[PDB]
Every structure is written in C-alpha cells, then in structure tokens.
Design a binder for this molecule. Structure first.
Ligand SMILES: *[C@@H]1O[C@H](CO)[C@@H](O[C@@H]2O[C@H](CO)[C@@H](O)[C@H](O)[C@H]2NC(C)=O)[C@H](O)[C@H]1NC(C)=O
Ligand SMILES: *[C@@H]1O[C@H](CO)[C@@H](O[C@@H]2O[C@H](CO)[C@@H](O)[C@H](O)[C@H]2NC(C)=O)[C@H](O)[C@H]1NC(C)=O
Ligand code: NAG
Ligand code: NAG
Ligand code: NAG
Ligand code: NAG
Ligand code: NAG
Ligand code: NAG
Ligand code: NAG
Lengths: 346, 369, 208, 50, 198
C-alpha cells in the first residue's frame, strides 16, 4: 500500500509562504443517533401456546424479567438519544418570506411547503438513499393477515413474538427541529443559542465569522459576490455527489442491516434440534409421553434461552456504541451549529 | 407485574393478549381395512435370524392397544415414540420383522451396537425409530433331544448394512487354502445351529423377537389409527389435528402452486405454513391467531386509580381477546383516554408523536400530540 | 459398445424432500451429482457397469431401445438379484427377488428430442427413483440451464447392489453420484431455478 | 472428531456469529489505527539543514 | 522439547492475525506529522503546508497563549536551552524508569491471559467421565458417548461465548481510548489548544 504522495517543503530561516486567495469548502459528516427499538416475548418465542412448555419455563426463575427490563432500557435510551441530539432549541423559529441573504442561496437546504412533509431537497435525497424497511410499523399483523403467497420476513418476525416499536419523535418533528435550527442560525447567528435571538444581516454575520477565524472583514466586503458564488457551487457539488454516489451513508446502512441480521438470526435459531429429536414442540408432545417429553422440552428451552441471552447481550453492546455516537453528535451540534469552533479538525 | 403495592406515573408493558380457540377439528383419511397383527403374532413357527421375514403393512386402522392380548411379553421397548401414544398420531408404512434368537443376544437388538447378531445377522440403523417386542418361547421352540431348526451366521467378510439379509451359504475362507466347497482345516461353514434344550438356564433359552419399524409422515399417509374425523371449518381460530400434526391456527384458501408429490409447506423457522387435507385434495393455509402486547398507562397511585390500555401493533376493529373511548394510534390503539385538539409537553410517551397526561379541568386521562 | 467422455454442464438436480418452500435459499447435503463432472457417453451398435451410490441416466432414443435395468452383485444366481424389466405397451415396474421370491411389486408410472433424466438411489435399504422429461434443441452434448427432477417410486429392497446393467443402435449418458452439499434457490412458485455446488471452486465456497 | 462435528451441527448458528463478532473486532482495530495515525494527506520531509 | 504456549494455542485452533499497517508505516506517518509540525506550523492541518521560521512560529504560539513576542525574541537562547534540557530529561526518564508504559503492558497482558485461560479451559471434565474426547469414543458406546460429548460441547461452547463477550467489551474500551487519542492528535499536534489540562 501507498501512504501518500511524497513532499519536501522548502524551509529556510528567512523565507515564508503567505496565501493570496481562498476557497470555500462544504463537507458532509454523517453520524448515527438512534437504532431500532425491539421487544421480545419469551413465552411466544420459546413455547408458542404450550402449557407444558410454560410450566417447564416457570422453574427457571427470573431470566425473562431482566431480559425485558434490559430491552425496555435500550428502547427508552434510543428516544433519549434522539431528544438529546435534536431538541436543543427552545422556540420554533421560521424563516421570513423574503429570501435574500446577500447573494447566498439557501433555497435548496430550507424546507418547501409544496410537499406533504416539510423536508428539503438534501433531506429527501438522504431519506431516499437509505433503504430503511417498514419494520412492521403500520399494523404488521393486519398486513400479514392477507392472502398473499409472498410471505414476508417481517411476518415471521412478528409471528415469533419479536415486535419493533415506533419512535417517539416522527420524521416530521425531526424536520421541524432541523428547520427551526436552520432558520435561527441564518437569521440570528450564534445569539439564539445563548439567549434570545438577535437579528443581524447575513453579510455582517459572515464578517463576524471571518473576524473570528482571523481575517479582516474588508476581505469579505471586497469579495462578497465571489464568496457567494463559491458557496453556491459547493452546495451544488454536495447535491451532485449525493445524487450520484450511494455509498456515503454506509453508517446508517449498517445501523439498519445489523438489526435486520440480528432479528433474522433470532428467527432462524428456532429450527435447531439442540440435542433433542425434533425442533417442533407439538411433534415432541405428540410423539412422547410425559417424562421423556419434559426432558426434550427442557433441552429446547435451554437452547432458546441461550439464543435469547446472546441477542440481548449483543443489543446492549450495540446500544452503548450508538449512545456514544449520539453523544458525539449532540456535542457536534451544540458546538458547530450553535456557535463557532476553534478546535482543529473539529 | 412490578411486585409492589405502589405504582408511580408512567407506562408499563404487562402481558400478552391472545384470542382463544373455539372448537377442535381432526382430519384423517377414510380407511376401513384392518391389517392382521394377529397373523404376525400368531404363527406355528418363526424364521431364523439369518433368514428373517419382512412384512409390509399399509392401508390399515392400526389398533395397537390390543397387542398385549396376543403375546406374553413385559416391555414394549420403543426407541423413537412412546408405547402409550401410538393410537393418536399416524405413519406412512409399517414393517414387521420376526425372528428367534437366544437370551444372551436380545440386548443386541438396539440401534448402534456391535456383537454377533447386530454385525452378521440383523443390523439396525443409528437413526432407527420403532419398537422391539421380545418374549420367551421355551415351551414352543425347545426340544429335550435338541432343537436344531434354528441357525445363525457367525462368519462373514464384512459387517452387515442396516436392514438387509445374507442367506447365501458359502464356505468361509479362514486361511490361505481354497475351500472348494469342502469343510475342514481353515474352512468352516458360516451357519451354526442352535442347540436349544428346556434344561438350560434363563440366558440360553430361545426368545422370539418382533421388530416394528415405522416411517415418519413425509409421504401421503397410508396407515392411520382409530381416530374419528371431524367436518372441516374455516376462517376461525381452531385447534387442528392433520394426520397427527397438532396445531392451533386459522385456515384459509391457499393460492400456492403445490406439486402433486408435496404434502406440507414449511417456513423459515420450521413452522407448517400450509397443509394438504387428507380427505379432499385441497391446500389450506395456517395463520396464527391474533396476539400482541398490552401496556398500562397510569399516573401515580397516590393521585388516582384510573388507567388506560394501549394495544400494540393491532388494528382495533378487533379489540376483544371508561370503555367508550377508542382512539387509533400508530403504536396500536388506545382505550380509556380521549383525544383532544390541543398541544402540551409530553408527560407519558406512547408512540409516534402521541403522548398522554392526567388533567383536571372532571379529572381524566387525555391523549394529545 | 464404444465409449466416449463428455461434460455434465451443471445438469441433474432434484427436489430433496416432499415439502414446499417459496423464495427461500436452502442448503441440502445429499447424494447429488457434481457440476461439470465427467459424465460417460455410451454408444451401442458389454460388461456390467459399476454401481456406486446412485446412477444418473440420460438418453435421447425416442423409439425405446433402453427398456429396463438389471441390478445385483452377480448376473444370474448365487447372490441376491434384481429385475426391473419394463416394456412399451403397458408401463410395468415388475420387480422380482427370485434370487425363492421375497419381494414383488407392480405399479404404473415409470415412463410418461426428449431427455429422460433419471436418478437411481440406494440408501439404507430404500431404493428411490427420480425422473424428469425435458425438451431439447441441438441434441448433441448436454444443454445449459436448470431442470429439476421429481420423486417417482420408492421401494423397500434391502440388499446390496454393486453392479448394474441396462437392457437394450442406442446412445446414453451415465453419470456417477457423490455425497455433496448443494445450495438450491426456490422460486416464488416453488421451482428450483438455480443451484450452487458448495465444493466446486472457492467462489462457490464463498457463496455457500 | 466426526461424531462431535455431527452433534455440533445441531446447535444452530452460534459459531457463525462468533466468527462475525471476532471479524468485526479485527476490522475495528485496524480502523482505529488508521483513524489515529493516517491524518496527514501527504508525506513530508525535513530539509537536510538541521 | 520445550513447548511454548503459542504452540498449544495454534494447535487448539486459536490464531492471531497480523495488523494491516506495519511499524515502518506507522513510523513513516509519525515522521511525516513531525516534519509538518516542525517546518510548516499548523497550516498543513488547514490546507497546503506553508513554510515559516521556527522563531516566528514560537512567536505566534506565545502570542496565542497571551505573552507578547518580545519576551520570546529576547530570551531565545534561554528557551532553547530549557527545551533541550527537558528533552534530555524525558529521554533519561524513559531510559531509567520502566513503570510508565503500564497501559500498553496491560494491553499485551490481557490478550495473552485470555488465550491462556481459553487453552486451560480444555482440560476440564464438565461433569463427563474424561476431558479427552477420544477416550470417551474409545471407551463408551454410541448413546452414552453422545451424552458425554454433549456435556463437553455445552461446557466448551459456554467458555467460548464468555471469551467473545469479554473481547467485545475490551474492544469497546479500546475504541473509546483510540477516539480520545485521535482527538488529541488532531488538536494538540495539528494546532494549538486553549483547553485547560488538555
Ligand atoms: C480567487 O479564486 C477565484 C475562484 O477560484 C477566482 O475567480 C475566478 O476568476 C476568473 C478570472 O477573473 C474567472 O474566469 C472565474 O470564473 C472566477 N471563478 C469564479 C468561481 O468566480 C479569483 O479571480 C481568484 N482571485 C485572484 C486574486 O486570483
Ligand atoms: C438558488 O437555487 C435554486 C435551486 O438550485 C436555483 O433554481 C434553479 O435554477 C436553475 C436555473 O434557472 C434551474 O435550471 C433549476 O431547475 C432551478 N432549480 C430549482 C429547484 O428551482 C436558483 O436559480 C438559485 N438562485 C436564485 C434564487 O437567485
Ligand atoms: C540560516 O540559514 C542559512 C542557510 O541554511 C545558514 O547558513 C545559517 O547558518 C542560518 N542561520 C543561523 C543563525 O544558523
Ligand atoms: C374418501 O373420501 C373421498 C372424498 O369424500 C372419496 O372420494 C373417496 O372415495 C373416499 N374413500 C373411500 C374408500 O370411501
Ligand atoms: C393364534 O391364532 C390362530 C389363528 O388361527 C389360532 O388358531 C390359535 O388358537 C391362536 N393361538 C392361541 C394360543 O389362541
Ligand atoms: C386498519 O387501520 C386503518 C387506520 O385506522 C384503517 O383505515 C383500516 O380500515 C383498518 N383496517 C381494517 C379495519 O381492516
Ligand atoms: C474425463 O476424463 C478423461 C480421462 O482420460 C479425460 O481425457 C477427459 O478430458 C475428462 N473430461 C473432462 C475433463 O471434461
Ligand atoms: C455386497 O457384497 C459384497 C461381497 O463381494 C461386499 O463386499 C459388500 O460390502 C456388500 N455391500 C455392502 C453395501 O456392504
Ligand atoms: C409463477 O406462475 C405464474 C402462473 O403459473 C406465473 O405467472 C409467474 O410468472 C410464475 N412466477 C415465476 C416464474 O417466478
């Protein structure tokens, strides 16, 4: 492999290099915030309407109570992560109907009222580029009750007792938070994150940002149209990159795919014998008498309980990772969006 | 559920509701013939273990509970199924193998053992299912001068495959000299005759062994026991018994293109998704009956005793497993709380943008966005 | 009888069990035929052919020269022999265990520019027959594609077979079966449309 | 051991997800090393005057 | 004759994969970062590298921390002597004291100890008659041998699951430490930090 292009900067004790021009670069940073909230029914997953299996399962103590408590804690923690990341503004600001900001063009990141959902162009591209499944949201049992030969995987996941809960904050509310933050930032600068919003023209706000990074404001005031043109070209380059390339959202794709693979493995673990003679509980109860049937049901119960505990442990580890990423995203929001940051490569 | 007397304000998932089955249906093929177990367990003589007969039994109403009245045996030694549960479920084909051995080798009639009978006379497979019956026959096959009508094979080049015979009588090559059909030095006959006498011990007495080998239901069922059929019902949550396959679900028409040789349809997690009816050649679907989860929404017990019930993931024109309020949400639907056209902060979260709270201006539980 | 050697060209899969599956990839270990195998072509214008855990048979003669098959350890006597001789007027699967008759069985369906792809298996005393007819254009060699075989007849014989011989100008392909794991793709209608041989090349090992 | 392998095949897909977890850890370690060290776009060099 | 623990770890099926980046490439990356932060200031972290004299770069650092640059320019020899003495002192401290790299020593020791425990777990009976599998296959029949084999499989599978869970938790901790190290490399090396005790 190659580490990079070799360079040798000409250094002497009386020579300096000073820039004479500049570029404005817009970059894209993608961070996961929350994942799929799941709930597992032990009796439906292990036994599935069998009183003998329920009576054998009742002797194993309180494994399922702490499993349900852990999954409930993860499901609450996902909503806490989403609220912590997005709900940072106190009032829902809205953009004034005039759309001039000193030559800067925010028409294609701000929402438009034509669509039923108030989502912008880049937001719609990001919502379409991620292949997020319906995940059994809108009445999955009613959908699976239909006479369709194409049996869905979500049908088996629902029928085995694994339910996917919907989030507290919908996409319309998330887009409303995003629109409020965007309108507040554009119309007031950093003053809306430290009290009441104070209006300021956008050219003078950009002069404040230039004075913050260390360049005098006459540089902006003598290059305003050039800086606006460079910003518009950069935003258009972001839209062209997001329209062409589909591999940028691999983090959110992995967030979907890991939960899909975990639920698929948890469903597929029900077809294993686990040392018994059959993987069908009713077949065992029909073939065998009471004592030997109880032996085989105990073996199946132990195997399915091991599979459920493995799933819960992996969900806890992934929830910790997602919580760390959501805390990083909340810090990035509070520092990059609500103010100006002097931290290098942040 | 919380194992306490005081419940604070919040939402708690409690249990699972599930609609109960109403009736039960049993479906069996219409068979009236009676296969003769009587002619297998009553015979003047049984064949030798090197030449054991094999009787194939199909198209029968197999009454197993009468088998104890034909032969005086203790243990109806089954390996795959239960001896008392043979009258409910049913099979494809039955095979009956009858022979006579001595009492030292009756322990050798078992799946996966090494010896003389299990190596050179009668080998059972490792995945064998069925039952073995053995009973003493010292008053039938023993003679005071010596009963030599029973023989067994003790010399062979290789061990026997499961469920096969070897009745060829050729002189065993025990050395390097060719036998050429003449016994003598290093050339022994493969069949050695039993020497049964009534004055022997209990371990040398002759025993009659009958092995019933069963085949599981993968083919169309030919032999099934005496269980009466029931008229077919549809579109209701019913307990069904299809050829010994017991399940609980609702039956509908299936548009699946079943092949004529296929009887069952399988899911990903090994669940019978579809079944072919034995009486009429029809394909039926299996769908599990209605279920879900129930959540209780309450304020603190020091405040009030009013609760609301959220049914998760179900459309609620089907609630049955105050009571005049039903509001349809995205996370199931809500019973006991009224919807208002207002907006406050979220007190108790419910689902996609809907929260619940306790309000004073009569006090009641309201649900809002 | 002249003997030529040719290529299998991924032909000869069958439904492994009598259950239904739709849109599910399923892996099965069974007595299958390996892909791109060395199938052997015979032209008859004659020793006993070897038998080793199932034989795949293909033919193109439509005037029914190939009538039946004779199995066993020896040819005529001194062992346990089989006789599955069939003719063209009525389709009979008359099976004799004369060498002292101990197994007789008769049934109708064995036979109905056509390939009569047959697979014969002998596992644990159970003899299974798989049969499928297929149309063909450009009848030289073997076609490229997938056409699954279906179960026809089961028999409880309970012997060894180590030699087999066809009953007869004729041309037929004989392929040998090995224990092998396949990855079959069930369609929406339950039809086997594609299969991957799990021990062919590292790409198919990665697929499996 | 062929018999132990045959009784190991009946326990499901535990070892596939064990291999997946170990492969994820092994990829993540090199991702950590890359994201810590490889932050400069080019390779610089000190001039021979010191 | 002296069998190491690594030989038993390989013979029992626990191997170790090499990292993608070797120590030469890590040293080349470190040398590139050092050459940039010596000869170009912080500008290489914000685009192209711009050369600058080191005295003026120290003047910019002093003006950043809040001391007027004449203090630097009138005390250049004293500041250079102090920096050289501090470099020699930390070199002698790393030459003498060996208890400073305990974090990396623990990183090595944990992954040695986990594999040692995993190999040591194979000698247990888990309620069977013998820990050796071939002893049970040679001694017992099929059904009872399958019972003892099932007990041994359950015990070894539980041990492997425990090892994998511990490795996942340690991977999460190592990832958090690596994220902190990446932040420190971005903010200390490529610029100047105004954060107290960072
Ligand atoms: C600084 O860079 C900008 C763009 O990189 C330069 O603007 C270009 O100027 C040329 C000639 O004046 C035009 O043909 C281009 O169309 C301009 N580009 C854009 C995007 O407007 C600008 O001239 C540079 N400044 C200096 C002093 O060289
Ligand atoms: C601000 O941005 C919008 C959106 O990119 C520009 O609208 C585009 O204008 C071009 C040229 O007229 C058209 O070809 C596109 O179809 C327009 N797109 C949309 C979504 O309307 C607009 O021209 C920009 N400049 C302003 C408002 O001064
Ligand atoms: C400055 O650089 C030149 C060229 O490398 C060198 O000759 C001179 O000695 C340097 N100045 C000092 C004070 O070392
Ligand atoms: C069994 O029932 C089917 C359908 O009613 C009928 O066609 C068939 O003749 C019946 N068989 C007998 C033996 O009565
Ligand atoms: C056994 O069955 C035969 C059938 O004809 C009968 O004659 C005989 O009496 C039976 N044996 C006994 C002991 O009843
Ligand atoms: C399912 O719920 C939706 C939303 O209330 C409703 O429109 C639809 O009619 C319901 N389906 C039924 C009652 O079958
Ligand atoms: C089959 O084997 C023969 C052995 O001589 C060989 O010549 C022939 O090329 C093989 N066929 C193939 C590889 O398709
Ligand atoms: C068939 O008989 C031969 C005798 O030559 C023997 O070698 C072979 O093992 C027998 N078949 C089986 C399947 O054991
Ligand atoms: C299944 O069969 C139907 C009609 O028999 C046909 O229309 C459909 O295309 C088939 N599905 C396939 C070939 O995937």
């Amino acid at each position: 492999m190659s580490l990079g292009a070799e360079n040798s900067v000409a250094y002497s004790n009386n020579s300096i290099a000073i820039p004479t021009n500049f570029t404005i670069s817009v970059t894209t940073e993608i961070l996961p915030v929350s994942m799929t909230k799941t709930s597992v029914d032990c009796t439906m997953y292990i036994c599935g309407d069998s009183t003998e299996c329920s009576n054998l399962l009742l002797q194993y103590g309180s494994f399922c109570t702490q499993l349900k408590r852990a999954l409930t804690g993860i499901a609450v923690e996902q909503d806490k992560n989403t609220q912590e990341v997005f709900a940072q503004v106190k009032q829902i600001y809205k953009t004034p109907p005039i759309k001039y900001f000193g030559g800067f063009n925010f028409s294609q990141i701000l929402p438009d009222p034509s669509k039923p959902s108030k989502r912008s162009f880049i937001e719609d591209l990001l919502f379409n580029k991620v292949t997020l499944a319906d995940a059994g949201f809108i009445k999955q049992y009613g959908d699976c009750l239909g006479d369709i030969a194409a049996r869905d995987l979500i049908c088996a996941q629902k029928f085995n007792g694994l339910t996917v809960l919907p989030p507290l904050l919908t996409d319309e509310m998330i887009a409303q938070y995003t629109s409020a933050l965007l309108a507040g930032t554009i119309t007031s600068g950093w003053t809306f994150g430290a009290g009441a919003a104070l209006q300021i023209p956008f050219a003078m706000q950009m002069a404040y940002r230039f004075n913050g990074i260390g360049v005098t404001q006459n540089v902006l005031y003598e290059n305003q149209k050039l800086i606006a043109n460079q910003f518009n070209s950069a935003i258009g380059k972001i839209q062209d990159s997001l329209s062409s390339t589909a591999s940028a959202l691999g983090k959110l794709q992995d967030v979907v795919n890991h939960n899909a693979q975990a639920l698929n493995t948890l469903v597929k673990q029900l077809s294993s014998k686990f040392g018994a003679i059959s993987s069908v509980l009713n077949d065992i109860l029909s073939r065998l008498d009471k004592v030997e049937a109880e032996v085989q049901i105990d073996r199946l119960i132990t195997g399915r309980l091991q599979s459920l505990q493995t799933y819960v442990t992996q969900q806890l580890i992934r929830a910790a990772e997602i919580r760390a990423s959501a805390n990083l995203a909340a810090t990035k929001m509070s520092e990059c969006v609500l103010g100006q940051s002097k931290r290098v490569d942040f | 559920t919380l194992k306490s007397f005081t419940v604070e304000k919040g939402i708690y998932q409690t249990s699972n509701f599930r609609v109960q089955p109403t009736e039960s249906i049993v479906r069996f093929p219409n068979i009236t013939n009676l296969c003769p177990f009587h002619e297998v367990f009553n015979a003047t003589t049984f064949a030798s273990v090197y030449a054991w007969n094999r009787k194939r039994i199909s198209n029968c109403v197999a009454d197993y509970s009468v088998i104890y009245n034909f032969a005086p045996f203790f243990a109806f030694k089954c390996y795959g199924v239960s001896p008392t549960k043979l009258n409910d479920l049913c099979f494809t084909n039955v095979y009956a193998d009858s022979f006579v051995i001595r009492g030292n080798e009756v322990s050798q009639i078992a799946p996966g053992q090494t010896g003389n009978i299990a190596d050179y006379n009668y080998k059972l497979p490792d995945d064998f299912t069925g039952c073995v019956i053995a009973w003493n026959s010292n008053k039938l096959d023993s003679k005071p001068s010596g009963n030599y009508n029973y023989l067994y094979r003790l010399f062979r080049k290789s061990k026997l495959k499961p469920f096969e015979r070897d009745i060829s009588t050729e002189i065993y090559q025990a050395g390097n000299r060719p036998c050429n059909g003449v016994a003598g030095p290093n050339c022994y006959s493969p069949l050695q005759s039993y020497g049964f006498r009534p004055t022997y011990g209990v371990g040398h007495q002759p025993y009659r062994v009958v092995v019933l080998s069963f085949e599981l239901l993968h083919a169309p069922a030919t032999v099934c026991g005496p269980k009466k059929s029931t008229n077919l019902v549809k579109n209701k949550c019913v307990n069904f018994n299809f050829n010994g396959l017991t399940g609980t679900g609702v039956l509908t028409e299936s548009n699946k293109k079943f092949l004529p040789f296929q009887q069952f349809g399988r899911d990903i997690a090994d669940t019978t998704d579809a079944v072919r009816d034995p009486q009429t050649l029809e394909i039926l679907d299996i769908t599990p009956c209605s279920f879900g989860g129930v959540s209780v929404i309450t304020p603190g017990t020091n405040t009030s005793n009013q609760v609301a019930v959220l049914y998760q993931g179900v459309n609620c024109t089907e609630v049955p497993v105050t009571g005049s309020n039903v509001f349809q949400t995205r996370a199931g639907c809500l019973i006991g709380a009224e919807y208002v056209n207002n907006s406050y902060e979220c007190d108790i979260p419910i689902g996609a943008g809907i929260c619940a709270s306790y309000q004073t201006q009569s006090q009641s539980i309201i649900a809002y966005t | 009888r002249t003997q030529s050697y040719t290529n299998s060209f991924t032909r000869g899969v069958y439904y492994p069990d009598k259950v239904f599956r739709s849109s599910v990839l399923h892996s099965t270990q069974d007595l299958f035929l390996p892909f791109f195998s060395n199938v052997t072509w015979f032209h008859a214008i004659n020793p006993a052919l070897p038998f080793n855990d199932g034989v795949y048979f293909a033919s193109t003669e439509k005037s029914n020269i190939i009538r039946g098959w004779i199995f066993g350890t020896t040819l005529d006597s001194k062992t346990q022999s089989l006789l599955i001789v069939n003719n063209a007027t009525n389709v009979v699967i008359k099976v004799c265990e004369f060498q002292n008759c101990t197994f007789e069985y008769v049934s109708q369906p064995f036979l109905m520019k056509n390939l009569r792809e047959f697979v014969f298996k002998n596992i644990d005393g159970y003899f299974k027959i798989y049969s499928k007819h297929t149309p063909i254009n450009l009848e030289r060699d073997l076609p490229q594609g997938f056409s699954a075989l279906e179960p026809l007849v089961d028999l409880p014989i309970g012997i060894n077979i180590t030699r087999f011989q066809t009953l007869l100008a004729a041309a037929y392909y004989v392929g040998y079966l090995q224990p092998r794991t396949f990855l079959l793709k069930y369609n929406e209608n339950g039809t086997i449309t594609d299969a991957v041989d799990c021990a062919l090349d590292p790409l198919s090992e990665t697929k499996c």
